[PDB]
């Protein structure tokens, strides 16, 4: 029944640069019994610290956080390029939702790049269009298709993926799912996308049938 | 040393029954108190049941009320979790945790874990098994920007469990874009993986897509054309 | 009530409390000692652990 | 002074599935006395549980709720057709927000149509647009008036009718007021509806004068 | 069995007085404490005023502070709540509510109602009561989309309480839409009533529509062209 | 840690009718020790009372709240010209966001003029248009840019002004600054304000090259 | 009378360090507790520092911690704050502000603060003290609307503090837009100062605009044409 609820929802630094978690223990008060994770997102969780004071065994002695009464905080001394993980609080009943720790980087421009079914998808009994963007920062951005000049919504599945640790970009791809009945009535296929760091919203048309 | 070996899961129809195992070894099982734990795909981990050192009292969560039974075998030395007319919304990965227990006078177990195990992943969904469709996806004239390009393929109706996808043998990576599989309706599982590989390039050396799909044994490789 | 001046936010300096000592305190004495004390039966008083 | 705060805002589920609901005091415990009512829309509130534990002589045994501290969860053991109504929670001295408790059904495609004003109404000195959604699902939506094929909003009103038991789907409808003389010197008036079930937001466009 | 009656109420001009009654049959009023609570229209509800087994305490609410006043009548089986300087946003409809007690040693309330008796609604505004204007709803080519069609009618400048309409003296439904009506400027209330009715239809049958008006009983019917 | 949200943000009433202030905590009490600061927006915060109950002596006899625990509320017996100041909430460690009390007038028609770059801010390499909207009225409105007969937004800058004494009204501006390549490519700007007391959006172009 | 007056800031540059004075005139400057308040340009004020009366104790915030330090000098009369490493955001208003005390069986202070000083501007930048530069902006045919127009002056790279700006040596006024300055791009501040006064009227009187620059004493006057 209990909630515990986690802020900020996700928090960006540069990799040496500390922060704080402050998660809210929502009903009363835990009275120290807590615990904290880390996960990355390709194995297990582990733990970091319990009883909301001590530390665990093999925990690098930079992860050392307080909290008592409904606020309970987590101090991090200094940051390490290990970060990209979701941090966990641990209440007996609960569990949080979890924190995003994010490494920093100067703002990319998109490249977007719209692919058209191939003739193989266009014997199946399905069409589908896909715009990927490519080389992109921060993740935010709002993808936009025009069909027949006419904006739509409501039945595009739009996918996210993880940043790269080499370079520290992500790639967010979209696809339109639609019978063949619909696909030959439009001529003119076009992905806009915008972002907050682009002078201007990116549009690409596209024209059926190919050349 | 000491770890939690996770057994059963798998496809599932909805409403069915089904048994997880927790088979434990480095430490003393009886005397530690053992929870289970669960993970939707890519949403926040929650707590599911928990467990006395004997077995005789259980703490089964609200969402999970009536439909599991877990048991606690002290001389078998595992931990079982059974579960009963399975609801779609419980497609996840198990874990099981152990609660650290002081020990001393009063066992006193203190409400944290401490060693997660290698848990294992549950789907209910009421399709079946079929083999994926794959299709090239090369840019062709004027959608292709600049020297540099990006090629890859997209698997479609792939209803088994996540697919593994390489190129050429896996003998370059050239930043490989993983993007893990998105639920569509009538639940199939498409993904579709693409590396940023120049267009300028393709003539010289074969290039080659492996689909490894280990569930039914379909590998299926693919031939990329430029058109 | 000395709320207002002792408590500061973000944590206090630390005030202690002792958790054990051996023997019954003879009236009017005090135990500073800091040194690590142990509960279980392993050795201790020297090895943090 | 105590604010009573409902979790969700709102939750709909199948007729047969149960559900549960928690309310959060803002500080402190008052020794359990809370209540829980159930307001059908066109009657007044009846009361279901008192003190957070034990329920009134009465009402079915199906309504089980129980919480301590700052939380109060009341647990519904099934569903059934009566649950078309607001519960609200009752401390002392506040009141909750409440939560409707929705009837689940499938995705509905609305229909639109817009009606004019007539003679009588254009001699009276003001003119009154009405467009009128139809047989809708679910409860969101979003209407917007193309006024010289141009988007402007401010002066227009919204009304949606309650859900109706025979079909669990409903009516909504909007009027856009203005006077005569502004009303003559624009020509075109359009009227679209956004849905996150359709999947082209439909506009249906109108000309002035009739024939 | 046990009920209250709500007596009093209507349309008062801003600043002015009124009094509400609450008379309470089918129990022992001396015994219970009793309660008001407000409900503005399509909004919560809100604690308004309490009072004693005799009325020695009061309990206004800050909303109300020292605008309304609560009485106890005991002798003669009444609740009585008087305001002044009552102000516009204060709209709504009153529930005289009791509250529940054990009865034993010590009385002991519990701060939970069990009965909720009939609302009475009242009504500030500058306006005055006007008679409605209705006028047709019916398709005309072009407009109506389909065999299927819906007409109605639209009433205006119509301040007094709620009104009911009507088609065809009630002899049909075809899928009624009640649309409650809305508060416009210069305090004036909207309703627009539409049946479905396919409009190849007119013609063999009379399509007419009454608006009762109850306040001012403004009886008015009329009758629909298909243009 | 504790955060105190002052409700609502903008508190606009007629010089002459009463107002109220009410400030929501987030957790726990503080034994009723609360302060409320006026603050114009020139000078200095200035404590109005103390410990929520007690007036400071100096404070007009009009100023006097009070509340108990959870929430905190301050009324306002009569109205004086002097409210043109932020409210904030001073708590054991933290202070509000505050909020505004502005002095209610009727709704006002904006005027808008736009101002091209001179030929000096032509050389220079780098050229700004400058939107100003006189006397307007409440403190909401829009602006965008039409640059070549297309919305574009994210490159411009706004700025508002305070509340004037002698005529209760504002100017607003808007500062789109542009490359000079950039500027010659496209020909014709617009800019439209967008106001719900407008009977229809004011529309204003340019066209480059004067006369 | 009470007062502090606040001494030291200005401009310096990203990671130095800089230091400020409050002197006390009119009371006791030996029981009661200190406090430092700071506001930042357009936005809220928050707590930074606390210090008790013998001034062992000191209180800061998190975002101030590690590099502000706060003393209290009773003997000299002075509340003391040092700081290091000032970060950009760091750029506002510092207040010296008192802590009220009962002075009774015991100190007891309540935090709640009574008279506070006038502050001081501390600003941290990356950019260099640069003369403004001045241009005319007076409406020309087609573009002044009616008989009344705008005429004004923008200053431009003009990083110092607030600039004042006057219009032919003070002798007409007729309604002033002071437009605050705002910061762009390359840590800068801009103002644009207009004076609105009818178009059929220059041509026999001049209209000019100076600008008194304070911090470098770089006062500048410019006239202005009807282009
Ligand atoms: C806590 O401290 C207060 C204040 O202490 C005062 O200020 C300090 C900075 C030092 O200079 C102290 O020496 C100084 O007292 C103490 O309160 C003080 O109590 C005394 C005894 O009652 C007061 O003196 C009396 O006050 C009035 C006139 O003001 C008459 O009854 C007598 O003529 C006599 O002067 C003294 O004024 C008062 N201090 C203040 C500032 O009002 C207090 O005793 C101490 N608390 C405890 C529990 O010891």
């Given at each position: 029944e209990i909630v515990m609820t986690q802020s900020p929802g996700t928090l960006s630094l540069s990799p040496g640069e500390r922060a704080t978690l402050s998660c809210r223990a929502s009903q009363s008060d835990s009275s120290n019994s807590l615990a904290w994770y880390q996960q990355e997102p390709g194995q297990a969780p582990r733990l970091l610290i319990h009883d909301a004071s001590s530390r665990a065994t093999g925990i690098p002695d930079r992860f050392s956080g307080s909290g008592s009464g409904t606020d309970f905080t987590l101090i991090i001394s200094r940051l390490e390029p290990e970060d990209f993980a979701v941090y966990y609080c641990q209440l007996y009943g609960s569990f949080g939702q979890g924190t995003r720790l994010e490494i920093k980087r100067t703002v990319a421009a998109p490249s977007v790049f719209i692919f058209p079914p191939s003739d193989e998808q266009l014997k199946s009994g399905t069409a589908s269009v896909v715009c990927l963007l490519n080389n992109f920062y921060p993740r935010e951005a709002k993808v936009q298709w025009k069909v027949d000049n006419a904006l739509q919504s409501g039945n595009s599945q739009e996918s996210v993926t993880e940043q790269d640790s080499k370079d520290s970009t992500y790639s967010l791809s979209s696809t339109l799912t639609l019978s063949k009945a619909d696909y030959e009535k439009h001529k003119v296929y076009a992905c806009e996308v915008t972002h907050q760091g682009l002078s201007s919203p990116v549009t690409k048309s596209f024209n059926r049938g190919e050349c | 040393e000491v770890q939690l070996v996770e057994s059963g899961g798998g496809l599932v129809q909805p409403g069915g029954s089904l048994r997880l195992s927790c088979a434990a070894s480095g430490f003393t099982f009886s005397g530690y108190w053992m929870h289970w734990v669960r993970q939707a795909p890519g949403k926040g981990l929650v707590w599911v049941s928990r467990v006395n050192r004997d077995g005789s009292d259980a703490d089964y969560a609200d969402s999970v009320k009536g439909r599991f039974t877990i048991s606690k075998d002290n001389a078998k030395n595992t931990l079982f979790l059974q579960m009963n007319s399975?609801?779609?919304?419980?497609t996840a990965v198990y874990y099981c945790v152990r609660e650290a227990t002081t020990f001393g006078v009063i066992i006193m177990p203190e409400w944290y874990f401490d060693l997660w195990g290698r848990g294992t992943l549950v789907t209910v969904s009421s399709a079946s098994t079929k083999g994926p469709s794959v299709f090239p996806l090369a840019p062709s004239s004027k959608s292709t920007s600049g020297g540099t390009a990006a090629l890859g393929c997209l698997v479609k109706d792939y209803f088994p469990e996540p697919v593994t996808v390489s190129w050429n043998s896996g003998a370059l990576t050239s930043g490989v874009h993983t993007f893990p599989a998105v639920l569509q309706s009538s639940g199939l599982y498409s993904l579709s993986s693409v590396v940023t590989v120049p267009s300028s390039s393709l003539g010289t050396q074969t290039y080659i897509c492996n689909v490894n799909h280990k569930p039914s044994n379909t590998k299926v490789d693919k031939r990329v054309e430029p058109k | 009530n000395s709320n207002n001046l002792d408590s500061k936010v973000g944590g206090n300096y630390n005030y202690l409390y002792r958790l054990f000592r051996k023997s019954n305190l003879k009236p009017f004495e005090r135990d500073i000692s800091t040194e690590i004390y142990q509960a279980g039966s392993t050795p201790c008083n020297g090895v943090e652990g």
């Open positions: - | 399975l609801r779609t919304e419980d | -």
